[PDB]
Amino acid sequence: HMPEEVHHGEEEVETFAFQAEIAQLMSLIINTFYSNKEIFLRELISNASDALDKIRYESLTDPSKLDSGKELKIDIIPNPQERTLTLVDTGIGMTKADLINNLGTIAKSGTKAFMEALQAGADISMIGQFGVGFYSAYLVAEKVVVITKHNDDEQYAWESSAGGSFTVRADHGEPIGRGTKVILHLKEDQTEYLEERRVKEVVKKHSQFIGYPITLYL
Numbered sequence: 260h261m262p263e264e265v266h267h268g269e270e271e272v273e274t275f276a277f278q279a280e281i282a283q284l285m286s287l288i289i290n291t292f293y294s295n296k297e298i299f300l301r302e303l304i305s306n307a308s309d310a311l312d313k314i315r316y317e318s319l320t321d322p323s324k325l326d327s328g329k330e331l332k333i334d335i336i337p338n339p340q341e342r343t344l345t346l347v348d349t350g351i352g353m354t355k356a357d358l359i360n361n362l363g364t365i366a367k368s369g370t371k372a373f374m375e376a377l378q379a380g381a382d383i384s385m386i387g388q389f390g391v392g393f394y395s396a397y398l399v400a401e402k403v404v405v406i407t408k409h410n411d412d413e414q415y416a417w418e419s420s421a422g423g424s425f426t427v428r429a430d431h432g433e434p435i436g437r438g439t440k441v442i443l444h445l446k447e448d449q450t451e452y453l454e455e456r457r458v459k460e461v462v463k464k465h466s467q468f469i470g471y472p473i474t475l476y477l
């Protein structure tokens with residue numbers, strides 16, 4: 260009795276190409292010698308703060324939206340043994356449709372405009388003025404995983420190593436309840452961001468007036 264499941268039904272892991280504009284910005288960022296790479300953390304904290312603002316406001320008109328977690332917070336977890344730096348917020352999260360669209364497609368206009376500004380003399384620290392600061396993660400990471408959970412959808416995992424494509428799959432792993440978890444698989448030359456004195460240094464410098472608590476775990 261050796262049955263064979265020849266058809267699973269749904270495709271478990273889906274692979275898609277970025278819009279060319281996004282892929283080209285990602286290649287620029289992952290390979291640049293720009294020497295102020297710590298700005299990646301400000302950009303991720305800024306995205307977390309925006310997502311936390313969003314669930315905070317929706318919870319005013321609908322307090323049940325906080326059933327998936329009442330505290331609004333940011334946690335930062337360096338992991339030397341896995342060479343990862345993780346940021347987890349309890350913001351509004353993203354549905355599958357918005358996860359694919361926002362990271363894979365809709366960022367095209369911002370990444371294109373940003374590359375044009377860079378060619379004209381702008382600097383990489385301006386990336387957030389184009390609405391695409393997330394991709395500054397590749398200043399320090401060779402691979403980025405985004406786990407996200409929105410009240411209206413199930414938990415999903417996105418990942419890309421900036422080779423032109425990303426994958427999205429349902430995440431049946433540890434529930435995050437609500438929010439977004441960004442896992443940075445760090446470049447070998449960027450492991451200073453696995454150290455607590457360094458991470459705290461960067462948070463104090465760039466994110467000192469963020470309106471949510473930021474906790475560091477070691």
Ligand SMILES: CC(C)c1cc(C(=O)N2Cc3ccc(F)cc3C2)c(O)c2cnoc12
Nearest residue numbers: 303306307309310313350352353393439441
């Ligand atoms: C992947 C990147 C774009 C990102 C998205 C969200 C997220 O789920 N967002 C961002 C955002 C911004 C505005 C808004 F209305 C809703 C949302 C949902 C985050 O909380 C973080 C944290 N670091 O990187 C993040």
